[PDB]
């Protein structure tokens, strides 16, 4: 209250995470499971393979027969249970998917075989020399070999990608319990903002943050609501916020919250909404005037982020604070971002504060670390790349011995997009 | 023709890329630009900032007045062109977004100022001590400082993410020319396959590849078509393929194309479709029986991939060959995958062939290289992770001196998902 609390980066991060709830669950079709977190253990209802299956192209054979000269009684078809029993001195053609027939207990690949006789040839083999003494069970995948019936194939907490979805198809579990995704409402405040579709007017600029922020969170596959530009006054701020609270889990705003300004939005969170503002300023560059609040409303907790209006500050703070909170909301067990080591492409002058620059990570032939070419000082000095920024260069706060960093020095980088 | 051509991994990759066309263009709303490639240069139609803007909270001042005692004639409002001219001995309140008024040419931050007088106080300042001699132009962002009118802000070939979308909003370019995304049709062939929704029947298994493959390509944000399970016969293969050709750019099938089998599908591509099969087998593990064909139909080129039916082979080959082809199709200038250096978590026995294992990349505190824990030998030996595989461990072909690799040795890894 009054000039709000100044916090450290680390303390702010922990606060966002600790104050953010994990959302409840719902049942979805497995095809909609990308990026979802299982809220249940998934068990197999069948043994895979469900029948003993050949591991190779070759012949289902009796081991006891040994390397003799044999009669080919037929072929085991994929998708068809075999009807014939392999008797002494007989053999059945088999392909690598194929069910082992009732009389054989070994498979001899075709390479340890030679055609002796063919029914003239209208595409048919009648006799083969089996050149090998096979071991009982050889080249056969027994029932339950891959997955046993009742066994847990996916555990609670698994964050699912393509292969997990395919594992669910395999076991025939097509509906599945998972954590909900957060719905995120985005708005921009400022009397100087116009919609990107509008032409400029005196004293006005186009609003870019709303579209950048909506785009950033859509990339993680979370549903969004566009609440538009809200005038910078208590009446319109309150109404905008009330609509986001009723329609969303998270509200993000950006615009005029610095040392001067912070006023109307903090004033409505505090007085009208009775939200609990956890911090209003964070010791960092850029994004010092970042606010984090929570509203406990009807047993439910909504989270609110007031990001700065500066376009680079808004995108940085979204990636440092918002995305991690959303990752926890949708059930991810470790919602922290991946941070990797890279080399600076340039020299940089450290600031007293921890600083974050949008950058591009590039891996060059046979080098251990990628190079981080900083671009996130954008606007008046932009040397355009064909690539998007895929990381945040995390510059350390200046020390007494470390005033600047040199090209080639190993530094930390938050991965913020697909490499 | 007859047993088709055996190719190397590298040769196969180049062939896929070289034979794959770049798709044409279309105009989209900028909000739909995620992952798109600009097909035009984008130029600014306004100077940003469009007015000279304050860089700080403080006062618009006359430099020539120096550090005197001044009368505050008002405040410059964001979104409003100022009406008053700052005269000698006067000053206007200003916030960091705010337009510089017509008489000032310097901004003195509030920290180099002291309140002298306030109109009693109903929230109002009347006089300030300016404690500093400002330089003309100080703390002011001139017109065009960030972007100049007519200047190129985004070039042809730019692969767009959130910040680019926001840059388009900034310049008011809301419709934009970009390369189309490929539409990809997926089908599974095999007489032994059932839909994941079905319960098992004798000799049958559930089809998992279709859902894994559809999921993998949806993750890159490309539109898909599910063509379902097609029986393994020429009539039904032809009809399935004809439908994918009429509705899609790319057709992917998986199922029974090994040394035994390859038959019906290659036979229909060759004889009925007259597609040009570029390769039918590739010297690799897994996925040896991978086929790549192209169809030139009515001036248009369709591409066809016949992936193996083995579930791990299908997902590996999709990431090595399909995704890169789709990346080129949607206009990406360098469609090759990112390959990084990592350490093996285990010992591995090299194979004569180049081998690929799905793995999980993990960065540990303060270490240069991530560790690659191989999991992609899946099915009968799976020690479950909460994380999805996010890379392909690229094991070198066995040599005379290098028979096996040890835990901790630096190896290559294709990044296949978000870190």
């Amino acid at each position: 209250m009054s000039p709000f609390p100044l916090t450290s980066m680390d303390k702010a991060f922990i606060t966002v995470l600790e104050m953010t709830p994990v959302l409840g669950t719902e049942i979805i079709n497995y095809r909609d499971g990308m990026g979802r977190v299982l809220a249940q253990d998934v068990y197999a209802k069948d043994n895979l393979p469900p029948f003993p299956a050949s591991v190779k192209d070759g012949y289902a054979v009796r081991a006891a027969d040994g390397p003799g000269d044999r009669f080919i009684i037929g072929e085991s078809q994929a998708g068809e249970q075999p009807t014939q029993t392999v008797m002494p001195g007989q053999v059945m053609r088999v392909t690598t998917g194929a069910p082992i027939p009732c009389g054989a207990d070994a498979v001899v690949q075709v390479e340890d075989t030679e055609l002796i006789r063919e029914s003239d040839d209208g595409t048919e083999e009648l006799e083969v020399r089996i050149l090998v003494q096979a071991r009982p069970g050889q080249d056969i995948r027994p029932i339950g070999h891959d997955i046993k019936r009742g066994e847990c194939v996916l555990a609670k907490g698994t964050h699912m990608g393509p292969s997990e979805i395919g594992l669910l198809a395999t076991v025939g579990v097509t509906e599945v319990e998972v954590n909900k995704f957060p719905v995120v409402a985005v708005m921009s405040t400022g009397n100087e903002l116009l919609n990107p579709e509008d032409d400029l007017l005196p004293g006005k600029i186009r609003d870019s943050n709303r579209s950048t922020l909506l785009a950033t969170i859509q990339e993680h596959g979370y549903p969004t609501i566009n609440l538009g530009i809200v005038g910078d006054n208590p009446d319109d701020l309150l109404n905008a916020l009330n609509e986001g609270i009723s329609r969303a889990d998270v509200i993000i705003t950006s615009g005029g919250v610095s040392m001067g300004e912070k006023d109307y939005l903090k004033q409505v969170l505090d007085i009208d909404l009775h939200a609990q503002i956890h911090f209003g300023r964070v010791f960092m560059k850029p994004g010092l005037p970042t606010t984090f609040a929570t509203l406990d409303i009807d047993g439910v907790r909504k989270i609110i982020f007031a990001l700065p209006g500066n376009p680079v500050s808004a995108v940085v703070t979204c990636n440092l604070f918002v995305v991690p909170a959303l990752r926890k909301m949708q059930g991810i067990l470790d919602p922290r971002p991946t941070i990797i080591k890279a080399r600076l492409s340039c020299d940089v002058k450290l600031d007293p504060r921890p600083e974050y620059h949008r950058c591009i990570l590039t891996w060059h032939h046979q080098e251990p670390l990628p190079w981080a070419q900083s671009t996130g000082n954008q606007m008046s000095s932009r040397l355009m790349s064909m690539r998007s920024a895929n990381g945040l260069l995390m510059l350390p706060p200046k020390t007494e011995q470390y005033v600047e960093l040199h090209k080639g020095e190993v530094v930390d980088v938050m991965v913020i997009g697909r490499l | 023709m007859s047993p088709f051509p055996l190719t190397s991994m590298d040769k196969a990759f180049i062939t896929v890329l070289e034979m794959t066309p770049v798709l044409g263009t279309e105009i989209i709303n900028y909000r739909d630009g995620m992952g798109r490639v600009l097909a035009q240069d984008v130029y600014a139609k306004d100077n940003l900032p469009p007015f000279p803007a304050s860089v700080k909270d403080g006062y618009a001042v006359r430099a020539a007045d120096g550090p005197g005692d001044r009368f505050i004639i008002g405040e410059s409002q964001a979104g409003e062109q100022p009406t008053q001219t700052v005269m000698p001995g006067q000053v206007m309140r200003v916030t960091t977004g705010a337009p510089i008024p017509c008489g000032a040419d310097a901004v003195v931050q509030v920290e180099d100022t002291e309140l002298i007088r306030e109109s009693d106080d109903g929230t109002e300042e009347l006089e300030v001590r300016i404690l500093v001699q400002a330089r003309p132009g100080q703390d002011i962002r001139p017109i065009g400082h960030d972007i100049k009118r007519g200047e190129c802000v985004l070039a042809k070939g730019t692969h767009m993410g959130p910040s680019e979308i926001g840059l388009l909003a900034t310049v008011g370019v809301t419709e934009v020319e970009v390369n189309k995304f490929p539409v990809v049709a997926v089908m599974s062939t095999g007489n032994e396959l059932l839909n994941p929704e079905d319960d098992l029947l004798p000799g049958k298994i559930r089809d998992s590849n279709r859902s894994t493959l559809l999921a993998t390509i949806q993750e890159h944000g490309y539109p898909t078509i599910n063509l379902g399970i097609v029986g393994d016969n020429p009539d039904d293969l032809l009809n399935a393929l004809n439908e994918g050709i009429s509705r899609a750019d790319v057709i992917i099938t998986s199922g029974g194309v090994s040394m035994g089998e390859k038959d019906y599908l290659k036979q229909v591509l060759d004889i009925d479709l007259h597609a040009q099969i570029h390769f039918g087998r590739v010297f690799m593990k897994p996925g040896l029986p991978t086929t790549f064909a192209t169809l030139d139909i009515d001036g248009v080129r369709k591409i066809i991939f016949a992936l193996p039916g083995n579930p791990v082979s299908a997902v590996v080959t999709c990431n090595l060959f399909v995704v890169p082809a789709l990346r080129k199709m949607q206009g990406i200038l360098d469609p090759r995958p990112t390959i990084i250096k990592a350490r093996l978590s285990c010992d591995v026995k090299l194979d004569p062939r180049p081998e690929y294992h799905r793995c999980i990349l993990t960065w540990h505190h303060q270490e240069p290289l991530p560790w690659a824990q191989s999991t992609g030998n899946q099915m009968s030996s799976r020690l479950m992770s909460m994380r999805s595989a996010n890379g392909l461990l690229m094991l070198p072909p066995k040599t005379e001196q290098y028979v096996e690799l040890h835990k901790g040795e630096v190896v290559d890894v294709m990044v296949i998902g978000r870190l």
Binding site: D10, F13, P337, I339, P354, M394, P396, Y402, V411 | -
Partner: peptide, 13 residues
């Protein structure tokens, strides 16, 4: 774990 960057010196081990 820290979301604040480390110095190249902290990379000594």
């Amino acid at each position: 774990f820290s979301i604040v960057g480390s110095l190249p010196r902290d990379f000594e081990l």
